Amino acid sequence: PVSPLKHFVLAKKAITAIFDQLLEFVTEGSHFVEATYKNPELDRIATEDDLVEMQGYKDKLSIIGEVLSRRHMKVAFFGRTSSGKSSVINAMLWDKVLPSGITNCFLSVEGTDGDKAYLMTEGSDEKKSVKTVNQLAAGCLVRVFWPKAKCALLRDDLVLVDSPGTDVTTELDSWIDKFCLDADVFVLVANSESTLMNTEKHFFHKVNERLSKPNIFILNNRWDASASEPEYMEDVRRQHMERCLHFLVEELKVVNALEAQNRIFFVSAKEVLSARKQKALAEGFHARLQEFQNFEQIFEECISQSAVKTKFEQHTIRAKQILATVKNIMDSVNLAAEDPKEIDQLEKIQNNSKLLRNKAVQLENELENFTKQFLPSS
């Protein structure tokens, strides 16, 4: 019943809440070391470098919470010109959000809390209309926005990118790569009335090196075309599987023979879009639909968990470090303060420093709790 994308959205709210308290806490502590340092009748209870540190952490942490809020999961599709890239995309969003046929630039599909479908382009924030400007409009990206109220995936922080045929483009496999580098999952949409090409395999060889251990799915689309032929279907499947397994397991070495059974699917996007646009059959239609729904399930488990790790961990780590250093600073103020009536200013200094350090520990415990739920194995 429960979309595994929920995992990413929950992680996102935790780390955003934690960083909200971190900025609050470090602002509080920054005023304290400032007060202590600037107090004329104190010798060197808090130093100027104590203060430059805190202010630095202060300036950092605001913009950190400013980024994770915009953090989303990204899936990018590749394949030859009529393999069914946009159809797979439209099948996952239960609607014809993108049109088949052609263009030659990337198309992302985002969510809007807003209610009308629309389209933006590069360096212009004017909201052009969804599908009339579709035909018309060193890479090139146009961004489609569809109402989050019409698709769970877009509600749940997923962005889906369409790429131009890998057939028809070289200038290399490079601006493609710096459109992709954000991406948590790469889907190869292959035409199953055909055979896995080397122009498609080479692009993924590029991604394989430039990025460490990418998640890749192979969708053998158009599996209609091979329908009704139950034993012919079994033997064609075997050959596609043998070529796909080889690529993932022995060529890209990106996965082992077993988990690769969870990366290769035989699917008919057209059929799925139909039965889904339908909520107002050839042989094996339901079987096909179930395999597509298995892929979606497995894909969501994979992208949710992966994107939590590669988009939130290093901020978690960095926050632990910030908290560590600020404990050191509280520790040293408390210590310098232990070495008339000045005495009761220092003891009050000492009490507030301990207050602060125990706040640091409290926040440290939450970070550690976050890492337990969301970052195995802590």
Ligand X SMILES: Nc1nc2c(ncn2[C@@H]2O[C@H](COP(=O)(O)OP(=O)(O)O)[C@@H](O)[C@H]2O)c(=O)[nH]1
Q: State the number of CA atoms in the 13 A half-sphere of 345 facing the CB.
A: 13
Would you count residue 268 as binding ligand X (CB under 6 A)? yes
According to the annotation, is 268 in a ligand binding site? Answer: yes
Q: Residue 289 or residue 329: which is nearer to ligand X going by CB? A: 289
Among 23, 25, 46, 79, binds ligand X (CB under 6 A): 79
Would you count residue 311 as binding ligand X (CB under 6 A)? no
According to the annotation, is 83 in a ligand binding site? Answer: yes
Q: Residue 219 or residue 307: which is nearer to ligand X going by CB? A: 219
In the complex, the smallest distance separating the C-beta of residue 33 from ligand X, rounded to whole angstroms, is 58
Token pair 């709210």 is found at: 13
In the complex, the smallest distance separating the C-beta of residue 219 from ligand X, rounded to whole angstroms, is 10
In angstroms, the CA 167 to CA 165 distance is 5
In angstroms, the CA 53 to CA 239 distance is 61
List of residues 6+ apart from 22 with CB closer than 8 A: 61, 319, 322, 323, 363
Would you count residue 184 as binding ligand X (CB under 6 A)? no
Would you count residue 87 as binding ligand X (CB under 6 A)? yes
Q: Which stretch binds ligand X (CB under 6 A): 8-16, 20-28, 54-62, 262-270?
A: 262-270
According to the annotation, is 224 in a ligand binding site? Answer: yes
Would you count residue 108 as binding ligand X (CB under 6 A)? no
Would you count residue 86 as binding ligand X (CB under 6 A)? yes
The footprint of ligand X on this chain (CB under 6 A) covers a number of residues equal to 15
Would you count residue 192 as binding ligand X (CB under 6 A)? no
According to the annotation, is 95 in a ligand binding site? Answer: no
Would you count residue 100 as binding ligand X (CB under 6 A)? yes
In angstroms, the CA 56 to CA 82 distance is 52
Would you count residue 164 as binding ligand X (CB under 6 A)? no
Residue pair 210/177 in contact by the 8 Å Cβ criterion: yes
- Torsion over CA of 362, 367, 373 and 378, rounded to 10 degrees? -120
Peptide bond into 377 cis (omega under 30): yes
Q: Residue 131 or residue 320: which is nearer to ligand X going by CB? A: 131
> Hey, is 84 helix, strand or coil?
coil
In the complex, the smallest distance separating the C-beta of residue 262 from ligand X, rounded to whole angstroms, is 21
In angstroms, the CA 89 to CA 287 distance is 20
In angstroms, the CA 356 to CA 359 distance is 5
Q: Residue 36 or residue 83: which is nearer to ligand X going by CB? A: 83
Q: Buried (b) or exposed (e) across 44-73, using 16+ Cβ within 10 A?
A: ebbbeebbebbeebeeebeebbeebeebbb
Binding to ligand X in span 219-248, by CB under 6 A: 221-222, 224
Query: Binding site membership for GTP: which residues?
Result: 82-87, 221-224, 268, 270
Q: Which residues bind ligand X (CB under 6 A)?
A: 79, 81-87, 100, 221-222, 224, 268-270
